[PDB]
């Protein structure tokens, strides 16, 4: 739901896999278990928790308070029923569905948000219900269930972009676009950060900036950064919060690897141990390394091992297998030679290859018109 | 309507009286004319609907449409009940 139990119950990923940080997460998880009816979530995740000595103590009180508030919402729902009104029943069934989102059961909340989803008098409240399914779909990490109601609720708005409704939906677009590895279309989502604000429901503003600094810092090139973020004053405002981000932006834009590799361990450790950002930690590292190697190797034709080893601050034995794996695996530039122990590329990728970029569509289009010949007579 | 009633002596005519909107007729028209624009979650439609007397239901439309301009002037995201009270003072002053 929109309560802090989304984040407190969202720390279960770092509570589960590492055994070092599993103390504070169970500290504020057990301390916060008396809030927002956290019984069923931590009872389901009880295998990743402590023993049953203190566990069975509060279950008897939470299981009866759940039934008490549940039957009070049922009595209030019966008092709202059989009466002339639309928003009253929407608030009763919607509040019952919010409590069922607090307990963490999407069966009665699925049929509840289905009933109040069918009682939507307007499309705005319908999109509000959709968002009410997205706030729990983040915890449930479902793929299609959160894209179905947004695919259906996306079209036919006709009421214009609000200040926090459309902006909040764009925030959700940033969420599911951070989950997926789509970057060239997700680089446009965070442009509305001027109107964004501290949203305790899903993600804090500093966490939204901390999450978009990866897709913006890696998924964008130097003209894209200079146009979008360097020209914009937003990163100039939010760089004063943490001095590290300014180092990872001015050091990357300044092409200083001696400090970027010494400070990259913080990006490595911080990159993992996250709810939605951990399983993609392998792609950001390699993509950023090949992006930096294409950045330095773009303006440089030939490169000696001395200036390269001093620039990157690493041994030649490692860059040997690096470029050796990035010739075939990376496929960044032409073949490299070591007849003089000097990185020397040619890159004839403009004159003839600029015309040869269409031969792939010529061969695939050739097989597609062979398919067109296959449609003949049958 | 007097001359028309002299020409229409209730022979074949549906006589439905059109009264000024009552309290509930101000809550429901306040909702129909409040869903179109922003609205906070800490407002009570009961008292703010009971504080809109006068001619007819177009006075509520005067509060809303003559309150969005104060939302624009104030440069806020939504509209509070105090702004609606200011629009009440405005349309009541105009009355």
């Amino acid at each position: 739901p929109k309560n802090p139990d989304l984040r407190i119950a969202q720390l279960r990923f770092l509570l589960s896999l590492p055994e070092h940080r599993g103390d504070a997460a169970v500290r504020d998880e057990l301390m916060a278990a008396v809030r927002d009816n956290n019984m069923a979530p931590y009872y389901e995740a009880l295998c990743k928790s402590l023993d049953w000595q203190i566990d069975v103590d509060l279950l008897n009180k939470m299981k009866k308070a759940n039934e008490d508030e549940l039957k009070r919402l049922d009595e209030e729902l019966e008092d709202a029923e059989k009466n002339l009104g639309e928003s009253e029943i929407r608030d009763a069934m919607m509040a019952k569905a919010e409590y069922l989102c607090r307990i963490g059961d999407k069966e009665g909340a699925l049929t509840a948000f289905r009933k109040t989803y069918d009682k939507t008098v307007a499309l705005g409240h319908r999109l509000d219900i959709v968002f009410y399914l997205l706030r729990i779909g983040l915890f449930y990490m479902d793929n299609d269930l959160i894209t179905r109601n947004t695919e259906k609720a996306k079209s036919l708005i006709e009421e214009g972009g609000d200040w926090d409704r459309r902006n909040r939906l764009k925030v959700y677009q940033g969420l599911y676009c951070v989950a997926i590895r789509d970057f060239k279309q997700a680089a446009e989502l965070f442009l509305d950060t001027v109107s964004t604000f501290t949203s305790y429901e899903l993600m804090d503003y500093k966490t939204f900036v901390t999450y978009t600094v990866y897709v913006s810092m890696i998924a964008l090139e130097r003209p894209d950064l200079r146009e979008k973020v360097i020209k914009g004053a937003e990163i100039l405002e939010v760089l004063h919060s943490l001095p590290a981000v300014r180092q990872y932006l001015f050091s990357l834009y300044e092409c200083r690897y001696s400090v970027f590799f010494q400070s990259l361990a913080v990006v490595e450790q911080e990159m993992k141990k996250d709810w939605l950002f951990a399983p993609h930690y392998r792609y950001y590292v390699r993509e950023m390394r090949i992006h930096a190697y294409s950045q330095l190797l773009e303006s440089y034709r030939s490169l000696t091992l001395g200036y390269m080893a001093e620039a990157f601050g690493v041994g030649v034995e490692f860059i040997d297998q690096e470029l050796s794996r990035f010739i075939a695996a990376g496929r960044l530039h032409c073949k490299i030679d070591k007849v003089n122990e000097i990185v020397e590329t040619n890159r004839p990728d403009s004159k003839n290859w600029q015309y040869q970029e269409t031969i792939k569509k010529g061969d695939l289009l050739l097989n597609r018109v062979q398919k067109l010949s296959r449609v003949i007579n049958m | 309507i007097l001359d028309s009633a002299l020409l229409r002596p209730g022979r074949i005519d549906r006589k439905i009286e059109f009264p000024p909107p009552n309290e509930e007729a101000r809550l429901d028209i306040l909702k129909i004319h409040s869903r179109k624009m922003n609205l906070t979650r800490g407002i009570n439609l009961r008292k703010i609907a009971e504080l809109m007397p006068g001619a007819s239901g177009a006075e509520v439309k005067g509060v809303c449409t003559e309150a969005g301009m104060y939302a624009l002037r104030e440069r806020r995201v939504h509209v509070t009940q105090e702004d609606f009270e200011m629009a009440v003072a405005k349309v009541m002053q105009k009355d």
Binding site: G160 | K36, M37, G68, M69, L72, R73
Partner: peptide, 28 residues
Amino acid sequence: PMDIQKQEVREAVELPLTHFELYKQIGI
């Protein structure tokens, strides 16, 4: 091929003019 028409024309005319999509985001 005053101040009533200056304030009224002011806020009703030039304030919507110097901003875009306000017709969409003011409750048209």
